[PDB]
């Protein structure tokens, strides 16, 4: 029931500012505090700051004091994080996490490990490139009896990431989303493949939902078997 | 300015008990919190308030704190426990939190695993877009090293190949991708294309042909 939903991924230039939101639901927003944690894709976790849902008081990391500003909107149940003067060392996944305790006596409800899905911001001066989506016709050479492998190919996009859904989220069993390659052109390309029963080939509808937030692009590609 | 110091990496054998420490000057009068973060996933709170364990965490995880040193113990670890572990506590005033450096746990003696290979030919839509891409997927192999090679007919491909660095998946195995970008003329001319996957001496070769 308790949930933290963050805003989508963004691209910024060196020197600009990024602002990520964090909408809370399932609990009294003013009783808890909300942390902010950043982590480079190949480095360690870093604590940024936290803000009270009711007081609004903030305590930032001494590394980020002067650049970061954490706010909150009680009427919207949403906390915000803004980081200015972005440099290449800021390319990271940004999370929001609810504090363990609430109230004046520091109690806990039916949860205490609540993390948002994460927002990957990428500071760069390169061009924002949209993705191209191509269907991967179902194949049966990769066996498991009565199972076919079909998917979608997301080609030439920048920057990361690209999230791929299947049938608007109704298909999760057997969904394998591979990490993207870094081509010599500077663009990325990944593939998302799902394994389905062979009896559903030609009767069940399969559509992949490609979402590239850095370019405001969404593609729903129908995946049908080949017609030879 | 406050810091929590963790060992950079610890190694353990299956069934053995692994100890991951965390030293901090305010730990005598401040609680400690532990997080498990596997490769490619979000951290998970496994230990809160020095010793307490949240619901859903296996009982083999436990923690203790004494003096300026907190400790995380994993009794009888398996391959699933192979991940990074971070420390988490506050400073003297208790208004700012600090994460530890991160301890990488490694379980020894993991069996070899043969990779599965899947190769898709270029789609008819992409050929209409004056492009051609061959995707060679590799999954479920250990260790995380693989040698991918492409072939035009029977000769090695001279250009147009990109291969990912092998990354850990859910079941603590590895997966990789390999793409061969071609033109419609090259794909329609040669008799066949193949991606050769070599892992621990063994070799798997999948071949596709135009139309």
């Amino acid at each position: 029931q308790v949930q933290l939903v963050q805003s989508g991924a963004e691209v910024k230039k060196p020197g600009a500012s990024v602002k990520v939101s964090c909408k809370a639901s399932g609990y009294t927003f003013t009783n808890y505090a909300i942390h902010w944690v950043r982590q480079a894709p190949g480095h360690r976790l870093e604590w940024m700051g936290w803000i009270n849902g009711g007081d609004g008081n903030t305590k930032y990391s001494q590394k980020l004091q002067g650049r970061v500003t954490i706010t909150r909107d009680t009427s919207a149940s949403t906390a915000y994080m803004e980081l200015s003067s972005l440099r290449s060392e800021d390319s990271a996944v940004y999370y929001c996490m609810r504090a363990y305790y609430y109230g004046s006596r520091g109690l806990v409800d039916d949860a205490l490990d609540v993390w948002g899905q994460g927002t990957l911001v990428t500071v760069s001066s390169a061009s924002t490139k949209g993705p191209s989506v191509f269907p991967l016709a179902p194949s049966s050479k990769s066996t498991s009896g009565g199972t076919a492998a079909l998917g979608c190919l997301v080609k030439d996009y920048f920057p990361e990431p690209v999230t791929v859904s299947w049938n608007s989220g109704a298909l999760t069993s057997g969904v394998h989303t591979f990490p993207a390659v870094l081509q010599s052109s500077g663009l990325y390309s990944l593939s998302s493949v799902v394994t389905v029963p062979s009896s559903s080939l030609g009767t069940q509808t399969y559509i992949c939902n490609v979402n590239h937030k850095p370019s405001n692009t969404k593609v729903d590609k129908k995946v049908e078997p080949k017609s030879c | 300015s406050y810091e929590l110091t963790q060992p950079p990496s610890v190694s353990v054998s299956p069934g053995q008990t692994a100890r991951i420490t965390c030293s901090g000057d305010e730990l005598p009068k401040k609680y400690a919190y532990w997080y498990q973060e596997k490769s490619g996933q979000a951290p998970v709170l496994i230990i809160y308030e020095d010793s307490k364990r949240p619901s859903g965490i296996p009982e083999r995880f436990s923690g203790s704190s004494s003096g300026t040193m907190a400790t995380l113990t994993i009794s009888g670890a398996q391959v699933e426990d192979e991940a990074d572990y971070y420390c988490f506590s506050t400073d003297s005033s208790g208004d700012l939190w600090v994460f530890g450096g991160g301890t990488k746990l490694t379980v020894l003696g993991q069996p070899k695993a043969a990779p599965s290979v899947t190769l898709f030919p270029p789609s008819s839509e992409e050929l209409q877009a004056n492009k051609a891409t061959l995707v060679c997927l590799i999954s479920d192999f250990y260790p995380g090293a693989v040698t991918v090679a492409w072939k035009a007919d029977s000769s090695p491909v001279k250009a147009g190949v990109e291969t990912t660095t092998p990354s850990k998946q859910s079941n603590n195995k590895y997966a990789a991708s390999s793409y061969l970008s071609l033109t419609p003329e090259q794909w329609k001319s040669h008799r066949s294309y193949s991606c050769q996957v070599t892992h621990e001496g063994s070799t798997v070769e999948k071949t596709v042909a135009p139309t």
């Binding site: 936290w50 008081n57 | 009068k29 401040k30 308030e49 208790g94």
Partner: peptide, 14 residues
């Protein structure tokens, strides 16, 4: 002994 850190300015000490 040890206290908990609720929020900024909110800290139940020893």
């Amino acid at each position: 002994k040890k206290g908990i850190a609720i929020g900024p300015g909110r800290t139940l000490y020893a």
